[PDB]
Ligand binder design. Structure first.
Ligand code: 2HQ
Ligand code: OGA
Ligand code: NI
Ligand code: ZN
Length: 331
């Protein structure tokens, strides 16, 4: 078996290899990339997402989210407090202010140490799930707004036509902004492009070991576990690399820089944080290999997770028992 230790692999496709998205994902998997739960793809030197980022300041962040922590430094939850709307220009200025700016640091490792030591004592503001794209319409390769849709994948594989659409989301981050431990809806893939700014550090558990993370989470957040059989779907729980190591949970880490893609694979739990002001774009996608994961995906039915319009058809078709039971959380 390829990549038996489940290491995060980094790929350098040529411009020719960058033409056929599906084919390259399949190639990455032939080399065992999916075993890690996460891969990095560095685009060919000839490629660009768009010409410049000089004209993005007028984008609106309608509902910036203040990420307030509760718990201990290495085991905490965060809740999202809604703030007043601001433009990307205003958000950038806020990110760079004395209150919110990245502290002096030696390197990525020093910054990581500072993040886990001090994250809970601050409440950074994140711009999340803003529908939109920063890819130029003329960018033909790896344009996250031009991917084949999940609905079309299901139709190609299973012969059923379903309602729903599948569009990208923008994320504007600042120092300490955090993504909690999660897999994607329906255990889909995700692809994430860091358009500009400071790095994003990622942690990932191999899909073959996801249930180990779930078991630890139940132990560390016992009240949350009693409330919902899939509470990680709420996307609020953080566990540090130190705590993962202490509990023998297999995981890896990597830092994504501007101009780089990351792909998460079905049932690859991931979490992470931003180093400073940045902008990323991400979308879910599917392949034939995803279908078996989709049919087995856990679901939140306690009402906390209540997800997109397009998720309905996925549960309805792939998980009819669970759909019937839900009808008898989203509503
Ligand atoms: O939060 C939710 N849990 C669910 C489980 C099944 C279906 Cl069809 C929808 C949902 C939610 O919105
Ligand atoms: O960048 C973020 O804040 C979160 N991104 C993801 O979880 C993803 O791309 O799958
Ligand atoms: Ni994700
Ligand atoms: Zn729930």
């Amino acid at each position: 078996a390829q990549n038996p230790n489940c290491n995060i692999m980094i790929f350098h496709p040529t411009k020719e290899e960058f033409n056929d998205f599906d084919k390259y994902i399949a190639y990455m998997e032939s080399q065992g990339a999916h075993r890690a739960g996460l891969a990095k793809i560095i685009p060919p030197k000839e490629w660009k997402a768009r010409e410049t980022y000089d004209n993005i300041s007028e984008i609106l962040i309608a509902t910036p989210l203040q990420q307030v922590a509760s718990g201990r430094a290495g085991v905490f939850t965060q809740y999202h407090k809604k703030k007043k709307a601001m433009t990307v220009g205003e958000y950038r200025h806020l990110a760079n202010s004395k209150k919110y700016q990245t502290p002096p640091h030696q390197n990525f490792e020093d910054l990581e140490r500072k993040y886990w030591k001090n994250r809970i004592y601050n409440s950074p503001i994140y711009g999340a799930d803003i529908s939109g794209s920063l890819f130029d319409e003329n960018t033909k390769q790896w344009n996250l707004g031009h991917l084949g849709t999940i609905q079309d994948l299901l139709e190609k594989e299973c012969g059923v036509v379903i309602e729903g659409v599948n569009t990208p989301y923008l994320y504007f981050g600042m120092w300490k902004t955090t993504f909690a431990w999660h897999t994607e809806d329906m255990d889909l893939y995700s692809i994430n492009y860091l358009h500009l700014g400071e790095p994003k550090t990622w942690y990932v558990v191999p899909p073959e070991h996801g249930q180990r993370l779930e078991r630890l989470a139940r132990e560390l957040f016992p009240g949350s576990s009693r409330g919902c059989g899939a509470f990680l779907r709420h996307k609020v729980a953080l566990i540090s690399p130190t705590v993962l190591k202490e509990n023998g949970i297999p995981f890896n880490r990597i830092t994504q820089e501007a101009g780089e893609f990351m792909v998460t694979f079905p049932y690859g739990y991931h979490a992470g944080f931003n180093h400073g002001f940045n902008c990323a774009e991400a979308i879910n996608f599917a392949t034939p290999r995803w279908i078996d994961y989709g049919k087995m995906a856990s679901q939140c039915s306690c009402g906390e997770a209540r997800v997109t319009f397009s998720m309905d058809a996925f549960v309805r078709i792939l998980q009819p028992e669970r759909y019937d039971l839900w009808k008898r959380g989203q509503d």
